[PDB]
Amino acid sequence: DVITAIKAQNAQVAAGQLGGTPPVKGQQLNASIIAQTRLTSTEEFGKILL
Amino acid sequence: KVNQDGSRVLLRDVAKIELGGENYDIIAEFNGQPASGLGIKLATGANALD
């Protein structure tokens, strides 16, 4: 339960981008989407919910 | 899925299916006319004209 909850919260995932590769001709802006990030400290690992 | 009824769900309905390129990042225009080139890049210490 500890192990499975670690990779479920200490995750570095790959979400796409606003106005992606095939666009709707008329799009003005493009930005990469960030979902989850890898936890950086001992304190952030403390707050991992079980 | 099959539904609790008889109505069949297949990704013809749920999605739009087309035979297209795997990425939509790059496009080539030769003299304005739509094209696709083979930009051959040299090795290292190869033979050039050979």
From Swiss-Prot, chain B:
Signal sequence residues: none
Induction: Positively regulated by MarA, Rob and SoxS transcriptional regulators (at protein level).
Disruption phenotype: Loss of susceptibility to contact-dependent growth inhibition (CDI); inhibiting cells still contact the target.
Quaternary structure and partners: Homotrimer, with large domains that extend into the periplasm, interacts with AcrA and TolC. AcrA may be required to stably link this protein and TolC. Interacts with AcrZ. Part of the AcrA-AcrB-AcrZ-TolC efflux pump.
Protein purpose: AcrA-AcrB-AcrZ-TolC is a drug efflux protein complex with broad substrate specificity that uses the proton motive force to export substrates.
Family that this chain belongs to: Belongs to the resistance-nodulation-cell division (RND) (TC 2.A.6) family.
Name used for this protein in its record: Multidrug efflux pump subunit AcrB
Organism (species): Escherichia coli (strain K12)
Primary gene name: acrB
